[PDB]
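Regression check, chloride ion case 1752:
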Amino acid sequence: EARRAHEHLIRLLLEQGKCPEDGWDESTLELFLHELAVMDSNNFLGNCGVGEREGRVASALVARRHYRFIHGIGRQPKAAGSSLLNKITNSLVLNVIKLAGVHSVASCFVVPMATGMSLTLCFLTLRHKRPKAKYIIWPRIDQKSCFKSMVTAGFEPVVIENVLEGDELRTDLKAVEAKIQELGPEHILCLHSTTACFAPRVPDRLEELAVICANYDIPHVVNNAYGLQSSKCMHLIQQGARVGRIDAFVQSLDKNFMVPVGGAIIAGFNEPFIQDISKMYPGRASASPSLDVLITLLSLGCSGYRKLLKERKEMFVYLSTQLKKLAEAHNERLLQTPHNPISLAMTLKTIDGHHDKAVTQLGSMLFTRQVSGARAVPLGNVQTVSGHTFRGFMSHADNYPCAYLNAAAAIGMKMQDVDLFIKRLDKCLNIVRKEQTR
Amino acid sequence: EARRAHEHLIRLLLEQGKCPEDGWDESTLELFLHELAVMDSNNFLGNCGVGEREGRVASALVARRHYRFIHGIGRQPKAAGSSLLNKITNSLVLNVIKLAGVHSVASCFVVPMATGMSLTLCFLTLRHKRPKAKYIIWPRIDQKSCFKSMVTAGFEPVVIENVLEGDELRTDLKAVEAKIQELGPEHILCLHSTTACFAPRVPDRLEELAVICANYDIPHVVNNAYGLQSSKCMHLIQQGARVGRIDAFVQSLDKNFMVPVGGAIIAGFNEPFIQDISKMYPGRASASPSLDVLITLLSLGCSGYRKLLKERKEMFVYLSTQLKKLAEAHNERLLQTPHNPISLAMTLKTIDGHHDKAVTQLGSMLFTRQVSGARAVPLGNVQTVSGHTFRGFMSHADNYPCAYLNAAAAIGMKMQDVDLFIKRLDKCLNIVRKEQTR
Amino acid sequence: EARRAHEHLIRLLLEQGKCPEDGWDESTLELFLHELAVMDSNNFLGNCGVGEREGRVASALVARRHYRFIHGIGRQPKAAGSSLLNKITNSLVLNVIKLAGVHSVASCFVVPMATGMSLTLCFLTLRHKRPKAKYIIWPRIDQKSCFKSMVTAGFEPVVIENVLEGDELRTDLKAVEAKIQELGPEHILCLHSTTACFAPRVPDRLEELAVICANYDIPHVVNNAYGLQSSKCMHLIQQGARVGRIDAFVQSLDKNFMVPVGGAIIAGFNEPFIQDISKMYPGRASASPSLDVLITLLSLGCSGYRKLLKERKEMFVYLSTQLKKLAEAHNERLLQTPHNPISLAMTLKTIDGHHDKAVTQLGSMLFTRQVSGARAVPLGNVQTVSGHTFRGFMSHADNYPCAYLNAAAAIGMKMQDVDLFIKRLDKCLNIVRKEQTR
Amino acid sequence: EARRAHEHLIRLLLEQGKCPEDGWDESTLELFLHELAVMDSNNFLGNCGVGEREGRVASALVARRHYRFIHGIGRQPKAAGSSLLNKITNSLVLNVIKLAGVHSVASCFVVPMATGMSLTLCFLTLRHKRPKAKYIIWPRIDQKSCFKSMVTAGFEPVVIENVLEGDELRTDLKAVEAKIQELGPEHILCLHSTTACFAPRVPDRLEELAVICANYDIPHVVNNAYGLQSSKCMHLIQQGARVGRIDAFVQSLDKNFMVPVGGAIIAGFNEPFIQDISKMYPGRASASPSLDVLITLLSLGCSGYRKLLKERKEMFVYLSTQLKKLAEAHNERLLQTPHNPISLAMTLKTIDGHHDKAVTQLGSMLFTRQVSGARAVPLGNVQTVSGHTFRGFMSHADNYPCAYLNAAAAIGMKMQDVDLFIKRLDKCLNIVRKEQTR
Ligand SMILES: [Cl-]
Ligand SMILES: [Cl-]
Ligand SMILES: [Cl-]
Ligand SMILES: [Cl-]
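Current build output:
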């Protein structure tokens, strides 16, 4: 019987909480969602509501687009279907974290805030654990949201400059320890490290930082914003947890799962602590990020997600081979950034140094040609963000040797993304050089 | 011409940013949304994306249900359509705040966090303005999210007990000032007052608190979670701003606009300050709450929203008349709470005092009968929430004179909500009394 | 339990096949549709298809918009869900025919052809019953589809001119009988009469025609295209069946049920005959009309449909009162057409007779002003349709005394339809008269 | 600019009426559909409607699922958007007919009836051209809809038995001519031939029939129900038109385009004649089939459709290779039917002849195992359909030599359709043989 086959799939999901190997048909998915929504009190046929939060909906377009899930999520029930939705979604995500390369993950939850505010929530929770602490030690990465996250939480970021090793910018482990000793471990809220990042920065030395955190008894929060899509980044987290201390790692829903911006996952190795972060959240929250990742994971299944991850690696190879060929044809080179598995950079030395803002102009030319996501990084940008002045802003160092153009192979990239980029970049560079050579 | 008529409506919205008097047809609305989405780079036909946040979507169900808005909202652009969506939505909401009764509002923004976290954001911003402050003075209201909001922000709530005046619980203005003097104004982050609330508590004495805040130079943040739907609550805020100091007022999207849980509006009278709160938010955020309230307001228009507000007042009268008749028929009474325009309470003295947990049982019986939102409040509940032990928890006082049942006429209530509630309550009370009388 | 309440509604529908008194919520409706679609083989999870009609769908937009019903309808099964959909829909429609005023209806079915082709199907079936017959006797009504229906079926229409009685055009019963006698009853395929029609024609004298058909042993097919919405029209059919012979009556889905054009209902009093018409249909047919009327009737319920019918009568009174006031203010009059319960006409004598095509111009002016559905009927139109030349075409007579403007109160009409029409008509008439009076 | 790129695609479609080489994004498609719907009067913001067919819609679910196209299609305008929809759709389909292999097609139109009723419409039109004719000469194919089509139209089918040539059943050209001479050409309405059909019948000898029709001056209507997906079938039609007479060819929308059952395309080589068939249709008709094929073709583009056609050929090879291997492993054989490009048959001699209804049982076993579309054809079925008794019904001959199982590779078939079929068939045959061998 037709209906029993759908029931079987739904039952296997409910009982184990695991991502199905193969993706569900849309029919099964919508049957499931409609069944869950029926469980929420706002949807009961016999319901009468006499409170201030009844999940009433004025617009049919709004009700429908959300599959009639109106009550949001929490951490007798007013929304039994939404609670089941939350629980299942968190189970699927824990599973996917394991699939992605952190097999020893203990606990996780979706929070419908993006990664910056999600990091803030971790810091807000740590405040109560460490009431003496005022500082967050942070290996520099020129991205405003993660920097702000510390200031928003009410802490003083201690910016640790990176080391130039060949073309790569890497964790200055000695500088990290020197600041710990200077300021006093009891005065440090946590170390706040970062995995996936713009080349030529690479993921932080998490093994070594984890040892430092263990030894000094300082919490360690990892900004894994877009590292979940990378088995290399995820292995770093796993290894870090094996050899030292990692208290939480945070990742974007949109960047790793191809869903709208708005949600993140907070995960860790100590269940009581991760639950403490969740409990620190005041009030109900949007169910929309959770619904998006639930639909996506059930539709892809383990196989579909694994396929995307494999395809990302394949596209990274393709982008790298194509960008290196282009670069060399224009007497540039691909920066040597073997430790960055997602992001890469070619030099822009041939257009830089003419005192004409050509590097910045190139970024603009790419944008006008409907290339999104490229970063043309010039030398000497100065920018002040929330009390800190960054010299060499965009380059994660005060004195990076050259200007460069940064592109990345993130999950969902297609051959046409690479091919169009290369075609357009070639044209733009030819235009700039023509203009510069009279 | 057909198309020009739609264009006219869209143009009038874009140019002025005001809520249309009469609601748009769905056709016009969807034309508009499709046009905005086209403006976002992820939707360009000629786009190639080479970054880590390209707004790629794996599931067609996810893409469609969000009208192809994937990039989220912020405070060259990657998402021009989403930015316009954000700007328009905030304009419409400012307009509606004026319509609702705070005509002098200067600035506001939708934040896709619910009201508890939105209050936290206000507190997080005030930390930087007042680095010496550790305390938040807070007239007691037994609701976990707003209490937590203070603790989550990293501040110590100073719980001010309420005064019993007749049947009402009201602001203890003398106790508020005594704590200000005891602790020192410079040590107070803000006063955190509350408008709409469970009867028999009533909205705080905002005029008087505003004078206190002005005189002591202490910020004043108003928890207006579900007060926007009440012209009486909104007038209180307006008057408060006229006679003293109010720095921010926060309201729920779901409770005042009949949309899913997940978003709130932060509003105030000083544009630089409100903008400072917005700037304190790290990173991009979900566009989903904004889209929901945009669809809702364009669909209702000013007239449709005004109608809902009028209907709410009419339903409050109906609920009050019906509940008083029921109460008196069971030898109970309607508590005299004229200062609460949304929430009301009947006594439960006839079932209380038998040492059998009958009051709590009644709440359970109502819930099992698909009555949502009623609160059966017994005497003597003790609960500890985030470091504070509340005696008489649920009753907003240690020693409220009697047990009671609390129901409310919130926006969107229907006659059947009242009628079914009354029918079911009558039956439940008859059952309990039968059991108690052997 | 929430789910059981939905099940109860679905079970009551499946067991009895009756229209629910009150309309279902959308949630219940979509649960039901999803459950039915699951029953169709194209939707089985374990299905493999090795035939030429597997219900495969290339576009997700197409699959979704049809609720995954792909197999169409017929009169072991490949589409058990679609067959149930067909059966239920026909049951609901039979019920509604009774509600609408033909209580003695025996059998009916939805056919996804519009009313003209549906009449053709009746004629095609009668051919086999009456192989000697070549003629269809037809009281004139100037509407191309019903006229064509006879020619398309391969029969010769015998056009019976109407009688002028006061302002009304009515059935010429003597002319009908004279043609029967002249041509011979055995040579007449059927009499083809019409109920709802453009004023000042009125519904045919069905009682008297039914007696004629009974006495001469000639089938009687009633064109009830838009009469189902009228209890007066429906009573005429009922009475006709009581006092004489009516073999089939046909009505539009779109005109009586506010759904897209495309379907009709064939109904009658002799089940074997109505089933013979259904059996005459070759092959599978679209399920889309049936799905539309099923969704509509379940959503309205008996109460919602009854309400629309009552509202139509109320709007007819309003349109008549408003149009008479307008007419008289312009020195015109409302034609006296008490026997037409839907359609009415005001005279246009004041603009006619200037040899300037003013009547036709008025129709054009109304159309340019976004008035749809009005008919400005001039004198002296000659048009040939499928072998017959109609003099006075549009007026259902060769020599109707005056030009007129025809408007109607059909199901779903709103006060604004009347008010805008009246406002626009007033302006147009003033313009024409100004132009004509130099 | 983003919007201009969509406009470009829409403009190129409107100006030329051709299928885009590459498929449109959904965004472009929905923009286009919303724009067309805006053009229909029921959707005008300023519209007032005072007629009986205003396209009013009671249910939002119905309005939305049809993209607000309510007025249907025809052959001043009430539905300018629907008329454009009809015109464009017919243009795209003409284009696709050329792509599919009838390059010389002159005219075509979508009719929202399935293929049986569409053939009826052709016959109904021919009646008026040939008022003396009563007979339709028809090479036998055991399919009820196409047989009925002739009877429904009011004509007497003259069933021409097929010739056994090897394993194939083919057109008996001599028998066709003998009947023409016996009955008289002037008494023949048309020859009604068939292309795609169940093996071991093969497509009719259209070249030879076309010569016969030309020479005798008898119209020729081709039942191309599921031949459009086959370049071999389409070439036969093209060649037939080149060497003789073909007046119309009819094909299913669902079987060739992977859309819901309900529509067909009537096409031919003489524009006035094809237009005469269209003009014979009385009244408005559903727009739903046209919308489905429009969405499908714009979404696939020429490339996507070409790909499906290529994939069908590839799947036919796979099905044939797999079914032959299975058959031979069970001591059966694949019937030699090289002239049938879609349908194939393996023998069932090993289970036949035990007087136990095993062949029919096998069909039932396959059906119970969720194999759809297989046909287990036994010897000796007698069935009477609309006045004709077919001996050997299902086998297209009175005395086909053996029982067989018929499977087909139609458009949209997947490898899993073949693989599951083969796995299930193997099991079923093993079960039957076990039962038969005690
Ligand atoms: Cl990797
Ligand atoms: Cl109020
Ligand atoms: Cl009536
Ligand atoms: Cl082929």
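Comparison notes: Chain D touches chain B through 23 residues (CB under 8 Å). DSSP finds 14 helices and 16 strands in chain D. No diff flagged against the previous build.
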